[PDB]
Design a protein around this nucleic acid. Structure first.
Lengths: 48, 109
RNA sequence: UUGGCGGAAAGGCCUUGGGUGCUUGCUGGCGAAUUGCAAUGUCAUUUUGCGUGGGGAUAAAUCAUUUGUAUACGACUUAGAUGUACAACGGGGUAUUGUAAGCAGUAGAGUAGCCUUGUUGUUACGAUCUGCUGAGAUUAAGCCUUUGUUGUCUGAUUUGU
RNA sequence: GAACAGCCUCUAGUUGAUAGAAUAAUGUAGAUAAGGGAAGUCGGCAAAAUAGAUCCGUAACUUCGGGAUAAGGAUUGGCU
């Protein structure tokens, strides 16, 4: 916890997120979900 | 009569040689196999079949195969045995592709 | 022995009860001497023994192996005596590349043959092109997933108030 | 390929040079780099930059011989 209290207009600012990134960090990720991946790519050959 | 098991393995040499100097690629691949056989068979004495050294060195000092399907046999030395009671013999496996395979115990007949 | 109090470094203070000595508060008996005329003339602990005996609960570190959140070496962070374990391979995921080999094609600039008489003949050569094929290949070596397969699981040394 | 250039190979000859371990800093040798482009530096030192061939085109000046590959531009593969 913070050792002090400050306003600074940067501490009391309420943060409501709009979206969180979940693309792979192992490369230049294009999809944020395996379902979104399957929808963009269509059926693959491995999709037996 | 125990500890005479022979198995067949695939060693991922691509993983082990990652970043290795090109002139030490094949020479270290031989050392990795002896290290690999020691891990699985518990033997410091590891012998390589001359045919296996050919497979490691087939594409030159630097082009070591990514996977080698190999057979490692734990056998006994004889004729005024040395300090090690067991040694592991590694010989190559003639296979179309070394990919997708599992380690299997192969009978010594 | 019973009650407490004391954290600043308390580790010591006060205690109610019994026993047990002493008591120079007062009065006695006996002793001491030759340490020779002084000689500090010797009076209060730490630690040890196949010490004595009354008790007391029967561990870890280090090497080696392993790890990469660490690292010149040392050092560090981890794991490791039957597990929701560890390892090796695979299986999936995730990423990189860019469509594998092979086989076909009435594709193809054209070209040389022969004509069982040309929609959609034909035997050959031909960079390429199309299809099977966002395929194939690689993927932790410091990626994720430890279930499918195969293994491993009591080696060395030192440490005591 | 223009070529006893470079590169690869045959005959022949060697496989010699202390080695083993993951290779920290600093090095030595070899490299790459966003945007800028010599602002660096005594100084473009070092490095980089279209380099072969074919076609085109080529200024000042000149001792008329040159300058000249001046400058500058285009093409280059494979196949039939």
């Amino acid at each position: 916890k913070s050792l002090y209290t400050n306003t600074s207009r940067k501490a009391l600012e309420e943060v409501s997120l709009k979206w969180i990134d979940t693309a792979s960090k192992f490369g230049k990720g294009r999809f944020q979900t395996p379902a979104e991946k399957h929808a963009f790519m269509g059926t693959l050959k491995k999709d037996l | 009569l125990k500890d005479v098991v022979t198995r067949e393995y695939t060693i991922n040499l691509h993983k082990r040689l990652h970043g290795v100097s090109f002139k030490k690629r094949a020479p270290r691949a031989v050392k990795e196999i002896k290290k690999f056989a020691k891990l699985h068979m518990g033997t410091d004495d590891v012998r390589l079949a001359p045919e296996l050294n050919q497979a490691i060195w087939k594409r030159g000092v630097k082009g070591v195969e990514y996977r080698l399907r190999l057979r490692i046999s734990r056998k006994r030395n004889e004729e005024e045995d040395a300090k090690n009671p067991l040694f592991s013999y590694v010989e190559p496996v003639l296979v179309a592709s070394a990919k997708g395979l599992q380690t299997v115990v192969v009978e010594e007949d």
